[PDB]
Each structure stands twice: as structure tokens, then as C-alpha cells.
Amino acid sequence: SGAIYVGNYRVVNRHLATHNDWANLVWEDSSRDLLVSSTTAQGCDTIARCDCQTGVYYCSSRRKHYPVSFSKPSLIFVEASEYYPARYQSHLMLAVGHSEPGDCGGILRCQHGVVGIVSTGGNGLVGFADVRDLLWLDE
């Protein structure tokens, strides 16, 4: 679990969005596993606008932050789960690191701000859904 709060927006994994997120929907993309909903309160986070390929993410299944080197956002095959059929997930960044399904929503940050959130993983890998291209989050 986990979300990004920026301005009047809440960014979550689409597969973990609540009834309230869908009732206040701004934008969603099943191919990216992202959903953005509107909030009444001003958010605590700021978004990176950079090409960083190193950062630190929070891993709730270890209660720890880990440093990662990650690939540029790209189209990657993701095996079927209870939430989605087997498909290519877009704007996904891979890295070597521990992650379990409940870790989705953990934030990845670089020196510039929030880069993305945990969305995929397994077998010593962790995948992050990028949010740096979503320029409208800042306005």
C-alpha cells in the first residue's frame, strides 16, 4: 500500500484504488497500473522532473529503504495476476531489490523528488511505475 499526494491529487496503484478513488477519478491507465484521484486537502509530496536512474525506495515487507539503480521507463511483459491478465505494462522501470505484492505503493525518490511507486516484482526484482512524465500533476 501507499500513495503520492501532490497538490489536489492522490496517485495510487490502479489495482489498489478504493471506491473513493474511483468516485473522485481524474485519470487512470490500466497499461501503467496507475490511477489519480482528486483531494480536498493540499498534498505533502513534490514530483521529480529529471532523467535520474538511481534513487531510494521504501520496502514495507522489510520496513526499510533501499538504494536502487533502475532502467529507463519502458514496455515490459508482466505475468497474469488476480488483478490483470498477462500483458505488457508501459512506463515501468526495473531494478534489483526485494519486493512482495503488498509492497506496491512504496515510493521511489531521487534528489529531485518523487520518481514513481512500486508496481511489480518477484525473484529479487522490483518494478516502479514512473510518474515523472505526468506534468499536469504540478498544476
Ligand X SMILES: NC(=O)[C@H]1CCC(=O)N(Cc2noc3ccccc23)C1
C-alpha span between 134 and 113 (Å, rounded): 14
Interface mask toward ligand X for 72-91; x: CB under 6 A: ------x--x-xx----x--
- Sorted by sequence, the CB contacts under 8 Å of residue 69 that are 6+ apart come out as 53, 54, 95, 96
Do the annotations mark residue 19 as ligand-binding?
Answer: no
- Asked if 65 is an active-site residue, the reply is no
Catalytically annotated residue among 59, 103, 104, 130: 104
Diameter of the chain by CA atoms? 39
- Asked if 19 is an active-site residue, the reply is no
Do the annotations mark residue 50 as ligand-binding?
Answer: yes
Do the annotations mark residue 98 as ligand-binding?
Answer: no
Chain CA centroid to CA 39, Å: 18
Nearest-approach distance from CB 67 to Zn ion, in angstroms: 13
Q: Select the span of 19-27, 34-42, 43-51, 93-101 touching ligand X (CB under 6 A).
A: 93-101
Catalytically annotated residue among 21, 33, 103, 130: 33
The SS3 assignment for 64 reads strand
Q: Are strands 54-59 and 64-69 parallel, antiparallel or unpaired?
A: antiparallel
C-alpha span between 32 and 112 (Å, rounded): 22
For residues 49 and 64, which CB has a smaller minimum distance to ligand X in the complex?
Answer: 64
Residues acting as catalytic residues = 15, 33, 104
Binding positions for ligand X, rule: CB under 6 A: 15, 33, 78, 81, 83-84, 89, 99-101, 103-104, 119-122
